[PDB]
A paper describes a structure:
Destabilase from the medical leech [name] belongs to the family of i-type lysozymes. It has two different enzymatic activities: microbial cell walls destruction (muramidase activity), and dissolution of the stabilized fibrin (isopeptidase activity). The main difference between low and high salt structures as well as between the two chains of high salt structure is tied to a flexible loop (Gly44-Ser51), containing enzymatically important Asp46. Together with Glu34, Asp46 forms a catalytic dyad for muramidase activity in i-type lysozymes.
To get structural insights into destabilase function we solved its structure in two different crystal forms: P1—obtained at pH 5.0 and high sodium salt concentrations (2.9 M sodium malonate) and P21—obtained at pH 8.0 and low sodium concentration (0.3 M sodium chloride). In the high salt structure, both protein chains possess a more compact Gly44-Ser51 loop adherent to the protein core. Asp46 has two alternative conformations in both chains and in all cases is oriented towards Glu34. In our high salt structure, both A and B chains contain one sodium ion with 50% occupancy situated in the cleft between Glu34 and Asp46 and stabilized in octahedral coordination with water molecules by Glu34 and Asp46 side chains. Remarkably, in addition to its high sodium content, the crystallization sample of the high salt destabilase structure also included a muramidase product inhibitor NAG3. However, electron density maps did not reveal the presence of NAG3 molecule, suggesting that the inhibitory effect of sodium ions was at play. Given that the sodium ion appears near Ser51 in our high salt structure, we propose this serine to be the nucleophile in destabilase.
Author numbering:
A (entry chain A): 21 to 142
B (entry chain B): 21 to 139
């Protein structure tokens, strides 16, 4: 399963509560809210809520989206393998192929640091 | 992407190599070859090869057809969402709207068992 702990650590890496209500530009695209979701991701997760920005600025709608995204793409990305949080986090960062991409490994390392509590600061 | 694993499991569910060179009726109309392709599907994939049966009886020409059909119809069927193998398999069985049909759910269940090794 895609667990709440996995989801929370993805949130922390992306910025989480400090980004509620907020958008910025990333690589030419608007990216909004605690999970830093771009419009293609919101389309891919099934367009929850009332619209792109209104959903993705909001924590609850963003979480609905992320969970739907992981259900839709997890086993797709892995090629039928049971996915783990490593897969889900790498999918979040890199898209539906992200679990296989070298581009998402550093992102996973940040999520894993959160999950495993390493070099933790107050 | 439409992957080779997805293509292979579609092939297996349809009968695959046992159907090379063969046609038969399939829910009311002719289907041919390892992927059980009907003539409207062969038109919709761009009429590859020399003709309907001559292409679709053959594994390689059938695969050209299937690959073109998935590219043509995948994101159309999903309404702009990145397609998965579930979408592609369901499009194969049910046409350009197959990814959102009922009627294609049992077909996916069979393909999924192939992909997960359960089956
Ligand atoms: Na934060
Ligand atoms: Na991102
Ligand atoms: Na069929």
């Amino acid at each position: 399963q895609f667990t709440d702990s996995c989801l929370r650590c993805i949130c922390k890496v992306e910025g989480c509560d400090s980004q509620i209500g907020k958008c910025g530009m990333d690589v030419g695209s608007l990216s909004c809210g605690p999970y830093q979701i771009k419009k293609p991701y919101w389309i891919d997760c099934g367009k929850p809520g009332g619209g792109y920005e209104s959903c993705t600025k909001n924590k609850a709608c963003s979480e609905t989206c992320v969970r739907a995204y992981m259900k839709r793409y997890g086993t797709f990305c892995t090629g039928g393998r049971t996915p783990t949080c490593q897969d889900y986090a790498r999918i979040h960062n890199g898209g539906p192929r992200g679990c296989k991409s070298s581009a998402t490994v550093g992102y996973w390392n940040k999520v894993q640091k959160c999950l495993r509590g390493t070099h933790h600061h107050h």
